[PDB]
Design a binder for this molecule. Structure first.
Ligand SMILES: [Mg+2]
Ligand SMILES: [Mg+2]
Lengths: 116, 365, 365, 116
């Protein structure tokens, strides 16, 4: 199915892309909020990996805007040195789970086949 | 706390074992890295390099289930972007490691090799990020022209991405700081003002306070004490109300400026105020700078306190502080026509300058 | 005399007209260049760039006997090495032009772009030559770490070619000079000694004299006056006998060193000797440095002469000379406990330092 | 025929090489004295363009050493800011002519077909 990778850092995007292609998924990629929203609207991904740590546009903002496009959207958040309140808040908004960086490739891979 | 550059070079070593397909060694180093990170300073770039290496490490295992050369080409060819990024990081963090041990010539060499990898990265922010971080390094290395070159490339890319306002403000600070190195405070000021305006738009209090402080220091150094004091007090207000941890630095600028302006009684108030805000946890020396202000601008100069402080600074090799304080002391004594004392401090000034320069060059090619 | 960088950028303009196949314009610029060269400072590298451009210009004529884009690809494709070399020169001389007008940030940018063209040149000396010339530029730009980086790449290649001893000696001088910037004369000395030994092997008197002079200045600055005077006199001997045009510089070092050593009477002899060797044609200011020595180390300091000289230096923006002379004057007055006079000169010192820094940054991004 | 280009600067070598290939000559190239001598010994060129301004090994030295390998050797010297005595001296040693830098491509090209 369709997997949307949202992260402002080239490194993470390259990584998850190589990981999810190996699993046979159709992967999309976005560096910021707007790109992520356009893709959600156009492609309507089955699962999203959202970096809550993006400059200029907080993940909290991006998340709600994705719920607008689709209510049953499946979004897994990932953070690096992220607050506990932003994780807790994201959960209340229907977050399937949270992956702390550096995330274990196997853990996040098993979590994908699950909520997918 | 372990510097991320230190962890970076161990990852480089980890990588070496991987490319020679030595599982036992790779596993050891991988295990060590995972421990060091638990005590590492924050650096999300390092963590990315770590995660990519974890993936590269797994590829090695998946291909061992043929010469090293052959097997290596088998893994790398299909992984162009990964191999290219890893190479970039290994060189980058190696450059920063050299920089952190003051091996500047070595650092530059790695910085240059690292940059050559950028063209193979389809991401403009990644390029900006390199220029920004390197710009800071060149600044610390007092290669201010080269710093300006790089920081101007960072700012260009950042301005093309309006969401990167934070980096834009930081880039403006770097540009101003660079101008300061050439004593062109008037050239720095416009950038500090743009930073202030941007910071207020994004409603970031810390950067509003910092911008105002930077503007005040700029005016103080350009010789506009009135504007300096005005902005110091603006920074003070926003500090006391929303960002108190800036107060010590803000109150020291205000105090010093007031002392140079001959308003010592008013200054002493903010000096005592700043000393009360300082905590033991602090890593700064504003405590010693405050004490120096009291001692040198006191009706009767406190020469013993001054000697103890300068001796203290000498001990921790804080030659920048010695130069600045000695500059002040020389001016204070001159004002009372005590030129013997003045000359003594002028000699301390010139000495401190040479001690700073010597500390900048530790290599021996 | 016209700087070769100025002629270089006009050739760049000439090239632009060629690539847009504008014969009339190309002919005009070609004609101008051929005039400027008749008045240009010596630069065989410029002349090579000129000759290559002459060839490229002829190619344009031979292909006009189709869009600019198409016609351009027709000429360039078969001429890869020519097109690549031209590109390298246009960027190189443009960088030097910026450097010569003190647009340092611009210069660096062109230096970097120029270097990227090197990998496409199959010639190690060409690469060394770039690193050497750029190293000198970075040195003048007081980007001493970057200078060292580049000069170490030049020296590496030069040592692989034993016939390039001259460049090797010059490279050693640059390395020493760089260390001097950080006041590490002890680090410079080994390189100056290797330069001396190499210079004697190739039996080059000028470089023997210069090496000995450099060694003497090194010792003088490291605080070994005896060794300094010893080498000064060695340089003096070889000078008087084979390279007299070095005498003024040699006799000034000797004199200054003798004055600082308290041997003023002996110094005055070499001071008067140096003043007699100076010719009107000279472009140096050793005349003013000699006169300053007489004035400040005289039994009774000649304060009026000193003021006139420092004022003269101020006029021609010779702030380096002001700083050095003011340093001396301050020490002389201190020795007689005349601290008011001392303090005055110390202020001139600090002022000169700031004036130097300001003159290093003329841009205004 | 065979043309030996001797010059320490990449630029000059590229230039003359492109010029003499266009004329159908078989061109050789050397950056220094030794390379030049080895080629003279091995290839025995019909004409040599010798840069008298080469670091470490003066053209005067190189010239005589070429006369050793071949007495009837045809050598044209070229100089940049070169002395008048080194030109005069080179002539006495059997120099066909001298080309000052920057040399005119046509002049040196016509001179080649001449002494060749
Ligand atoms: Mg992020
Ligand atoms: Mg030559």
């Amino acid at each position: 199915e369709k997997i949307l990778i949202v992260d402002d850092q080239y490194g993470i995007r390259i990584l998850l892309n190589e990981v999810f292609n190996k699993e046979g998924y159709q992967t999309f990629q976005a560096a910021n909020g707007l790109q992520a929203l356009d893709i959600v609207t156009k492609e309507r991904p089955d699962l999203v990996l959202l970096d809550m740590k993006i400059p200029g546009m907080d993940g909290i903002e991006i998340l709600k805007r994705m719920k607008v496009i689709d209510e049953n959207i499946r979004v897994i958040i990932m953070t690096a040195y992220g607050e506990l309140d932003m994780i807790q808040e994201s959960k209340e908004l229907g977050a399937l789970t949270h992956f702390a960086k550096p995330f274990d490739i196997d853990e996040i891979r098993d979590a994908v086949k699950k909520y997918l | 706390a372990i510097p991320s550059s230190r962890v970076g070079v161990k990852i480089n070593e980890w990588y070496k074992m991987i490319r020679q397909f030595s599982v036992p060694d790779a596993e050891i180093l991988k295990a060590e890295v995972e421990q060091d990170i638990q005590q590492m300073e924050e650096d999300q770039d390092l963590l990315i390099y770590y995660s990519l290496m974890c993936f590269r490490h797994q590829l090695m295992l998946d291909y061992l289930e043929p010469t090293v050369t052959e097997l290596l080409e088998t893994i790398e060819t299909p992984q162009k972007k990964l191999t290219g990024l890893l190479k970039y990081y290994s060189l980058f963090f190696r450059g920063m490691y050299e920089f952190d041990q003051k091996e500047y010539v070595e650092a530059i060499g790695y910085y240059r090799e690292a940059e050559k990898e950028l063209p193979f990265v389809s991401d403009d922010i990644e390029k900006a990020e390199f220029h920004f971080k390197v710009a800071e390094a060149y600044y610390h290395m007092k290669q201010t022209h080269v710093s300006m070159y790089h920081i101007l490339q960072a700012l260009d890319i950042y301005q093309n991405h309006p969401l990167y306002s934070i980096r834009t403000i930081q880039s403006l600070f770097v540009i101003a700081g660079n101008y300061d190195d050439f004593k062109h405070y008037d050239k720095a000021l416009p950038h500090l003002e743009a930073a202030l305006e941007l910071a207020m738009d994004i409603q970031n209090d810390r950067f509003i306070a910092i911008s105002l402080l930077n503007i005040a220091n700029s005016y103080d150094r350009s010789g506009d004490d009135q504007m300096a004091v005005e902005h110091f007090q603006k920074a003070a207000k926003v500090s006391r109300e929303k960002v108190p941890d800036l107060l010590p630095k803000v109150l020291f600028g205000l105090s010093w400026t007031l002392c140079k302006a001959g308003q010592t009684q008013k200054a002493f108030q903010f000096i005592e105020e700043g000393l009360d805000h300082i905590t033991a946890r602090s890593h700064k020396f504003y405590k010693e700078l405050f004490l120096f202000l009291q001692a040198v601008y006191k009706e009767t100069v406190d020469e013993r306190k001054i000697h103890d402080l300068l001796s203290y600074f000498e001990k921790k090799n804080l030659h920048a502080y010695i130069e600045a304080c000695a500059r002040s002391a020389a001016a204070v004594f001159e004002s009372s026509c005590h030129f013997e004392q003045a000359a003594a401090f002028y000699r301390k000034v010139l000495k401190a300058q040479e001690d700073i320069l010597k500390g900048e060059c530790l290599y021996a090619y």
